[PDB]
PDB file of all heavy atoms in Angstrom:
ATOM      1  N   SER A  80       7.595  23.111  30.407  1.00 39.44           N
ATOM      2  CA  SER A  80       6.416  23.959  30.282  1.00 39.44           C
ATOM      3  C   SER A  80       5.351  23.208  29.490  1.00 39.44           C
ATOM      4  O   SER A  80       5.515  22.034  29.149  1.00 39.44           O
ATOM      5  CB  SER A  80       6.779  25.292  29.626  1.00 39.44           C
ATOM      6  OG  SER A  80       7.189  25.083  28.291  1.00 39.44           O
ATOM      7  N   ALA A  81       4.256  23.901  29.183  1.00 40.51           N
ATOM      8  CA  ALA A  81       3.117  23.327  28.482  1.00 40.51           C
ATOM      9  C   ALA A  81       2.669  24.279  27.379  1.00 40.51           C
ATOM     10  O   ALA A  81       3.366  25.233  27.031  1.00 40.51           O
ATOM     11  CB  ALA A  81       1.967  23.029  29.446  1.00 40.51           C
ATOM     12  N   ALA A  82       1.493  24.010  26.820  1.00 40.98           N
ATOM     13  CA  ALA A  82       0.994  24.762  25.679  1.00 40.98           C
ATOM     14  C   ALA A  82       0.098  25.912  26.131  1.00 40.98           C
ATOM     15  O   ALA A  82      -0.163  26.109  27.319  1.00 40.98           O
ATOM     16  CB  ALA A  82       0.242  23.838  24.725  1.00 40.98           C
ATOM     17  N   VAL A  83      -0.391  26.676  25.160  1.00 38.64           N
ATOM     18  CA  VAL A  83      -1.239  27.835  25.407  1.00 38.64           C
ATOM     19  C   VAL A  83      -2.678  27.450  25.111  1.00 38.64           C
ATOM     20  O   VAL A  83      -2.960  26.824  24.084  1.00 38.64           O
ATOM     21  CB  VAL A  83      -0.808  29.029  24.542  1.00 38.64           C
ATOM     22  CG1 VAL A  83      -1.734  30.193  24.765  1.00 38.64           C
ATOM     23  CG2 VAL A  83       0.610  29.415  24.855  1.00 38.64           C
ATOM     24  N   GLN A  84      -3.589  27.823  26.001  1.00 41.03           N
ATOM     25  CA  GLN A  84      -4.986  27.415  25.897  1.00 41.03           C
ATOM     26  C   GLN A  84      -5.767  28.455  25.100  1.00 41.03           C
ATOM     27  O   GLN A  84      -6.082  29.530  25.615  1.00 41.03           O
ATOM     28  CB  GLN A  84      -5.582  27.233  27.288  1.00 41.03           C
ATOM     29  CG  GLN A  84      -7.061  26.967  27.290  1.00 41.03           C
ATOM     30  CD  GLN A  84      -7.375  25.494  27.262  1.00 41.03           C
ATOM     31  OE1 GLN A  84      -6.519  24.662  27.555  1.00 41.03           O
ATOM     32  NE2 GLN A  84      -8.605  25.159  26.899  1.00 41.03           N
ATOM     33  N   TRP A  85      -6.102  28.129  23.855  1.00 39.63           N
ATOM     34  CA  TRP A  85      -6.908  29.012  23.030  1.00 39.63           C
ATOM     35  C   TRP A  85      -8.374  28.927  23.441  1.00 39.63           C
ATOM     36  O   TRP A  85      -8.732  28.293  24.435  1.00 39.63           O
ATOM     37  CB  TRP A  85      -6.775  28.649  21.557  1.00 39.63           C
ATOM     38  CG  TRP A  85      -5.440  28.910  20.974  1.00 39.63           C
ATOM     39  CD1 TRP A  85      -4.250  28.415  21.402  1.00 39.63           C
ATOM     40  CD2 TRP A  85      -5.153  29.711  19.831  1.00 39.63           C
ATOM     41  NE1 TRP A  85      -3.235  28.871  20.602  1.00 39.63           N
ATOM     42  CE2 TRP A  85      -3.767  29.668  19.628  1.00 39.63           C
ATOM     43  CE3 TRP A  85      -5.936  30.471  18.965  1.00 39.63           C
ATOM     44  CZ2 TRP A  85      -3.147  30.355  18.599  1.00 39.63           C
ATOM     45  CZ3 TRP A  85      -5.318  31.151  17.945  1.00 39.63           C
ATOM     46  CH2 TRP A  85      -3.938  31.089  17.769  1.00 39.63           C
ATOM     47  N   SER A  86      -9.230  29.569  22.653  1.00 37.80           N
ATOM     48  CA  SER A  86     -10.668  29.490  22.861  1.00 37.80           C
ATOM     49  C   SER A  86     -11.386  29.984  21.614  1.00 37.80           C
ATOM     50  O   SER A  86     -10.893  30.852  20.892  1.00 37.80           O
ATOM     51  CB  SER A  86     -11.104  30.295  24.089  1.00 37.80           C
ATOM     52  OG  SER A  86     -10.522  31.585  24.093  1.00 37.80           O
ATOM     53  N   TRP A  87     -12.567  29.420  21.371  1.00 38.53           N
ATOM     54  CA  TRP A  87     -13.418  29.808  20.247  1.00 38.53           C
ATOM     55  C   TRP A  87     -14.279  30.965  20.738  1.00 38.53           C
ATOM     56  O   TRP A  87     -15.217  30.772  21.511  1.00 38.53           O
ATOM     57  CB  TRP A  87     -14.292  28.649  19.795  1.00 38.53           C
ATOM     58  CG  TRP A  87     -13.646  27.680  18.891  1.00 38.53           C
ATOM     59  CD1 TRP A  87     -13.351  26.389  19.178  1.00 38.53           C
ATOM     60  CD2 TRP A  87     -13.198  27.903  17.553  1.00 38.53           C
ATOM     61  NE1 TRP A  87     -12.753  25.791  18.107  1.00 38.53           N
ATOM     62  CE2 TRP A  87     -12.651  26.699  17.091  1.00 38.53           C
ATOM     63  CE3 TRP A  87     -13.214  29.000  16.698  1.00 38.53           C
ATOM     64  CZ2 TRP A  87     -12.118  26.561  15.822  1.00 38.53           C
ATOM     65  CZ3 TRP A  87     -12.683  28.860  15.438  1.00 38.53           C
ATOM     66  CH2 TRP A  87     -12.143  27.652  15.011  1.00 38.53           C
ATOM     67  N   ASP A  88     -13.960  32.177  20.298  1.00 41.02           N
ATOM     68  CA  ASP A  88     -14.680  33.348  20.777  1.00 41.02           C
ATOM     69  C   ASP A  88     -15.628  33.900  19.716  1.00 41.02           C
ATOM     70  O   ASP A  88     -15.665  33.449  18.570  1.00 41.02           O
ATOM     71  CB  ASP A  88     -13.703  34.423  21.233  1.00 41.02           C
ATOM     72  CG  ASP A  88     -12.860  33.978  22.399  1.00 41.02           C
ATOM     73  OD1 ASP A  88     -13.392  33.275  23.283  1.00 41.02           O
ATOM     74  OD2 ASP A  88     -11.665  34.322  22.436  1.00 41.02           O
ATOM     75  N   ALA A  89     -16.404  34.902  20.111  1.00 41.21           N
ATOM     76  CA  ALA A  89     -17.350  35.588  19.248  1.00 41.21           C
ATOM     77  C   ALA A  89     -16.753  36.915  18.799  1.00 41.21           C
ATOM     78  O   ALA A  89     -15.644  37.284  19.185  1.00 41.21           O
ATOM     79  CB  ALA A  89     -18.683  35.809  19.964  1.00 41.21           C
ATOM     80  N   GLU A  90     -17.498  37.632  17.967  1.00 41.09           N
ATOM     81  CA  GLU A  90     -17.040  38.933  17.505  1.00 41.09           C
ATOM     82  C   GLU A  90     -17.219  39.973  18.601  1.00 41.09           C
ATOM     83  O   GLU A  90     -18.246  40.006  19.281  1.00 41.09           O
ATOM     84  CB  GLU A  90     -17.805  39.350  16.254  1.00 41.09           C
ATOM     85  CG  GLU A  90     -17.169  40.505  15.518  1.00 41.09           C
ATOM     86  CD  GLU A  90     -17.908  40.868  14.249  1.00 41.09           C
ATOM     87  OE1 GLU A  90     -18.942  40.235  13.959  1.00 41.09           O
ATOM     88  OE2 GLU A  90     -17.455  41.791  13.542  1.00 41.09           O
ATOM     89  N   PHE A  91     -16.210  40.826  18.766  1.00 40.89           N
ATOM     90  CA  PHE A  91     -16.197  41.858  19.802  1.00 40.89           C
ATOM     91  C   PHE A  91     -16.329  41.239  21.193  1.00 40.89           C
ATOM     92  O   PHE A  91     -17.306  41.454  21.911  1.00 40.89           O
ATOM     93  CB  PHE A  91     -17.295  42.901  19.565  1.00 40.89           C
ATOM     94  CG  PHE A  91     -17.117  43.694  18.312  1.00 40.89           C
ATOM     95  CD1 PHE A  91     -18.130  43.776  17.384  1.00 40.89           C
ATOM     96  CD2 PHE A  91     -15.944  44.383  18.077  1.00 40.89           C
ATOM     97  CE1 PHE A  91     -17.968  44.515  16.235  1.00 40.89           C
ATOM     98  CE2 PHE A  91     -15.778  45.117  16.927  1.00 40.89           C
ATOM     99  CZ  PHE A  91     -16.789  45.183  16.006  1.00 40.89           C
ATOM    100  N   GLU A  92     -15.324  40.454  21.566  1.00 39.69           N
ATOM    101  CA  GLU A  92     -15.283  39.848  22.886  1.00 39.69           C
ATOM    102  C   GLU A  92     -13.843  39.784  23.372  1.00 39.69           C
ATOM    103  O   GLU A  92     -12.939  39.453  22.602  1.00 39.69           O
ATOM    104  CB  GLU A  92     -15.903  38.452  22.872  1.00 39.69           C
ATOM    105  CG  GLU A  92     -15.784  37.727  24.191  1.00 39.69           C
ATOM    106  CD  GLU A  92     -16.115  36.261  24.081  1.00 39.69           C
ATOM    107  OE1 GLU A  92     -16.964  35.909  23.238  1.00 39.69           O
ATOM    108  OE2 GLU A  92     -15.533  35.462  24.840  1.00 39.69           O
ATOM    109  N   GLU A  93     -13.639  40.095  24.650  1.00 42.18           N
ATOM    110  CA  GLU A  93     -12.308  40.072  25.230  1.00 42.18           C
ATOM    111  C   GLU A  93     -11.730  38.663  25.198  1.00 42.18           C
ATOM    112  O   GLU A  93     -12.450  37.665  25.200  1.00 42.18           O
ATOM    113  CB  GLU A  93     -12.332  40.576  26.674  1.00 42.18           C
ATOM    114  CG  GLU A  93     -12.482  42.078  26.826  1.00 42.18           C
ATOM    115  CD  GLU A  93     -12.307  42.544  28.261  1.00 42.18           C
ATOM    116  OE1 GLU A  93     -12.150  41.681  29.150  1.00 42.18           O
ATOM    117  OE2 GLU A  93     -12.329  43.773  28.503  1.00 42.18           O
ATOM    118  N   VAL A  94     -10.406  38.591  25.177  1.00 39.27           N
ATOM    119  CA  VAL A  94      -9.703  37.329  25.215  1.00 39.27           C
ATOM    120  C   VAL A  94      -9.378  36.976  26.659  1.00 39.27           C
ATOM    121  O   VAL A  94      -9.358  37.828  27.543  1.00 39.27           O
ATOM    122  CB  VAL A  94      -8.423  37.359  24.362  1.00 39.27           C
ATOM    123  CG1 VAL A  94      -8.770  37.539  22.918  1.00 39.27           C
ATOM    124  CG2 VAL A  94      -7.555  38.492  24.819  1.00 39.27           C
ATOM    125  N   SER A  95      -9.106  35.704  26.898  1.00 41.33           N
ATOM    126  CA  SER A  95      -8.776  35.200  28.218  1.00 41.33           C
ATOM    127  C   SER A  95      -7.265  35.101  28.377  1.00 41.33           C
ATOM    128  O   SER A  95      -6.541  34.781  27.433  1.00 41.33           O
ATOM    129  CB  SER A  95      -9.438  33.840  28.443  1.00 41.33           C
ATOM    130  OG  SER A  95      -8.978  32.882  27.506  1.00 41.33           O
ATOM    131  N   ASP A  96      -6.795  35.406  29.584  1.00 42.15           N
ATOM    132  CA  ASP A  96      -5.365  35.433  29.875  1.00 42.15           C
ATOM    133  C   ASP A  96      -4.819  34.011  29.863  1.00 42.15           C
ATOM    134  O   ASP A  96      -5.249  33.171  30.659  1.00 42.15           O
ATOM    135  CB  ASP A  96      -5.131  36.101  31.225  1.00 42.15           C
ATOM    136  CG  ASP A  96      -3.683  36.086  31.632  1.00 42.15           C
ATOM    137  OD1 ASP A  96      -2.823  35.934  30.745  1.00 42.15           O
ATOM    138  OD2 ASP A  96      -3.401  36.235  32.838  1.00 42.15           O
ATOM    139  N   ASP A  97      -3.866  33.737  28.975  1.00 44.07           N
ATOM    140  CA  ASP A  97      -3.399  32.380  28.714  1.00 44.07           C
ATOM    141  C   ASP A  97      -1.891  32.250  28.880  1.00 44.07           C
ATOM    142  O   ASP A  97      -1.227  31.545  28.121  1.00 44.07           O
ATOM    143  CB  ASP A  97      -3.813  31.934  27.316  1.00 44.07           C
ATOM    144  CG  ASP A  97      -5.292  32.114  27.060  1.00 44.07           C
ATOM    145  OD1 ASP A  97      -6.083  32.025  28.018  1.00 44.07           O
ATOM    146  OD2 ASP A  97      -5.662  32.363  25.896  1.00 44.07           O
ATOM    147  N   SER A  98      -1.329  32.906  29.881  1.00 46.06           N
ATOM    148  CA  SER A  98       0.107  32.824  30.111  1.00 46.06           C
ATOM    149  C   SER A  98       0.465  31.462  30.691  1.00 46.06           C
ATOM    150  O   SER A  98      -0.085  31.081  31.728  1.00 46.06           O
ATOM    151  CB  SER A  98       0.552  33.929  31.050  1.00 46.06           C
ATOM    152  OG  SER A  98       0.192  33.624  32.384  1.00 46.06           O
ATOM    153  N   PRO A  99       1.367  30.707  30.071  1.00 46.95           N
ATOM    154  CA  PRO A  99       1.708  29.382  30.593  1.00 46.95           C
ATOM    155  C   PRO A  99       2.658  29.464  31.778  1.00 46.95           C
ATOM    156  O   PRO A  99       3.211  30.515  32.101  1.00 46.95           O
ATOM    157  CB  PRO A  99       2.375  28.697  29.402  1.00 46.95           C
ATOM    158  CG  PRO A  99       2.967  29.815  28.634  1.00 46.95           C
ATOM    159  CD  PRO A  99       2.037  30.982  28.791  1.00 46.95           C
ATOM    160  N   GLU A 100       2.847  28.319  32.424  1.00 43.50           N
ATOM    161  CA  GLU A 100       3.696  28.191  33.600  1.00 43.50           C
ATOM    162  C   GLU A 100       4.863  27.264  33.294  1.00 43.50           C
ATOM    163  O   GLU A 100       4.837  26.512  32.319  1.00 43.50           O
ATOM    164  CB  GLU A 100       2.904  27.639  34.781  1.00 43.50           C
ATOM    165  CG  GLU A 100       2.508  26.196  34.587  1.00 43.50           C
ATOM    166  CD  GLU A 100       1.232  26.053  33.785  1.00 43.50           C
ATOM    167  OE1 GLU A 100       0.825  27.038  33.134  1.00 43.50           O
ATOM    168  OE2 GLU A 100       0.643  24.952  33.787  1.00 43.50           O
ATOM    169  N   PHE A 101       5.883  27.310  34.137  1.00 44.18           N
ATOM    170  CA  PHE A 101       7.104  26.559  33.897  1.00 44.18           C
ATOM    171  C   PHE A 101       7.448  25.673  35.090  1.00 44.18           C
ATOM    172  O   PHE A 101       6.713  25.587  36.074  1.00 44.18           O
ATOM    173  CB  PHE A 101       8.255  27.508  33.576  1.00 44.18           C
ATOM    174  CG  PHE A 101       8.109  28.200  32.259  1.00 44.18           C
ATOM    175  CD1 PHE A 101       7.251  29.267  32.118  1.00 44.18           C
ATOM    176  CD2 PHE A 101       8.828  27.779  31.161  1.00 44.18           C
ATOM    177  CE1 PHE A 101       7.112  29.899  30.910  1.00 44.18           C
ATOM    178  CE2 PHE A 101       8.692  28.413  29.949  1.00 44.18           C
ATOM    179  CZ  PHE A 101       7.832  29.474  29.825  1.00 44.18           C
ATOM    180  N   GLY A 102       8.582  24.992  34.974  1.00 46.46           N
ATOM    181  CA  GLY A 102       9.111  24.181  36.053  1.00 46.46           C
ATOM    182  C   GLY A 102      10.547  23.822  35.764  1.00 46.46           C
ATOM    183  O   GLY A 102      10.946  23.676  34.606  1.00 46.46           O
ATOM    184  N   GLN A 103      11.330  23.694  36.832  1.00 47.33           N
ATOM    185  CA  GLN A 103      12.742  23.365  36.685  1.00 47.33           C
ATOM    186  C   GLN A 103      13.025  21.994  37.285  1.00 47.33           C
ATOM    187  O   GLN A 103      13.065  21.853  38.513  1.00 47.33           O
ATOM    188  CB  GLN A 103      13.648  24.409  37.356  1.00 47.33           C
ATOM    189  CG  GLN A 103      13.709  25.824  36.734  1.00 47.33           C
ATOM    190  CD  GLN A 103      12.625  26.791  37.217  1.00 47.33           C
ATOM    191  OE1 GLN A 103      11.965  26.555  38.229  1.00 47.33           O
ATOM    192  NE2 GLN A 103      12.487  27.915  36.519  1.00 47.33           N
ATOM    193  N   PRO A 104      13.211  20.959  36.466  1.00 46.39           N
ATOM    194  CA  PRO A 104      13.655  19.667  37.001  1.00 46.39           C
ATOM    195  C   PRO A 104      15.126  19.694  37.378  1.00 46.39           C
ATOM    196  O   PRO A 104      15.958  20.274  36.679  1.00 46.39           O
ATOM    197  CB  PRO A 104      13.393  18.697  35.846  1.00 46.39           C
ATOM    198  CG  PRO A 104      13.412  19.541  34.636  1.00 46.39           C
ATOM    199  CD  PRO A 104      12.911  20.892  35.030  1.00 46.39           C
ATOM    200  N   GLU A 105      15.447  19.039  38.491  1.00 46.09           N
ATOM    201  CA  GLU A 105      16.765  19.116  39.104  1.00 46.09           C
ATOM    202  C   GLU A 105      17.341  17.719  39.279  1.00 46.09           C
ATOM    203  O   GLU A 105      16.645  16.815  39.749  1.00 46.09           O
ATOM    204  CB  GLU A 105      16.679  19.831  40.450  1.00 46.09           C
ATOM    205  CG  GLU A 105      17.939  20.559  40.837  1.00 46.09           C
ATOM    206  CD  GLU A 105      17.686  21.671  41.832  1.00 46.09           C
ATOM    207  OE1 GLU A 105      16.706  21.569  42.596  1.00 46.09           O
ATOM    208  OE2 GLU A 105      18.465  22.648  41.849  1.00 46.09           O
ATOM    209  N   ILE A 106      18.608  17.546  38.911  1.00 49.08           N
ATOM    210  CA  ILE A 106      19.259  16.237  38.957  1.00 49.08           C
ATOM    211  C   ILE A 106      20.560  16.304  39.747  1.00 49.08           C
ATOM    212  O   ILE A 106      21.608  16.631  39.174  1.00 49.08           O
ATOM    213  CB  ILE A 106      19.542  15.707  37.546  1.00 49.08           C
ATOM    214  CG1 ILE A 106      18.305  15.825  36.671  1.00 49.08           C
ATOM    215  CG2 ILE A 106      20.000  14.276  37.610  1.00 49.08           C
ATOM    216  CD1 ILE A 106      17.206  14.920  37.080  1.00 49.08           C
ATOM    217  N   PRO A 107      20.556  16.015  41.043  1.00 48.63           N
ATOM    218  CA  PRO A 107      21.819  15.940  41.781  1.00 48.63           C
ATOM    219  C   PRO A 107      22.641  14.737  41.353  1.00 48.63           C
ATOM    220  O   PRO A 107      22.120  13.754  40.828  1.00 48.63           O
ATOM    221  CB  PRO A 107      21.370  15.814  43.238  1.00 48.63           C
ATOM    222  CG  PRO A 107      20.010  15.237  43.154  1.00 48.63           C
ATOM    223  CD  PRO A 107      19.394  15.795  41.915  1.00 48.63           C
ATOM    224  N   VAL A 108      23.947  14.828  41.587  1.00 50.86           N
ATOM    225  CA  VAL A 108      24.914  13.819  41.167  1.00 50.86           C
ATOM    226  C   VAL A 108      25.604  13.258  42.401  1.00 50.86           C
ATOM    227  O   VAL A 108      26.103  14.021  43.236  1.00 50.86           O
ATOM    228  CB  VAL A 108      25.936  14.410  40.185  1.00 50.86           C
ATOM    229  CG1 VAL A 108      27.085  13.463  39.997  1.00 50.86           C
ATOM    230  CG2 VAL A 108      25.272  14.676  38.857  1.00 50.86           C
TER     231      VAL A 108
END
């Protein structure tokens, strides 16, 4: 996975949706 993207906001302002994403690395034998 990765990090969460913040933001410099002002007073009385909605926040932005910052849900991170994932991934599954796979290793066959």
Side-chain angles (χ1 to χ4, degrees):
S80 66
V83 177
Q84 173 92 17
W85 292 57
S86 47
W87 278 113
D88 297 322
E90 194 178 2
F91 295 126
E92 175 193 328
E93 285 188 356
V94 295
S95 61
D96 176 21
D97 308 330
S98 76
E100 69 276 16
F101 291 77
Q103 292 86 16
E105 209 157 27
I106 311 292
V108 168

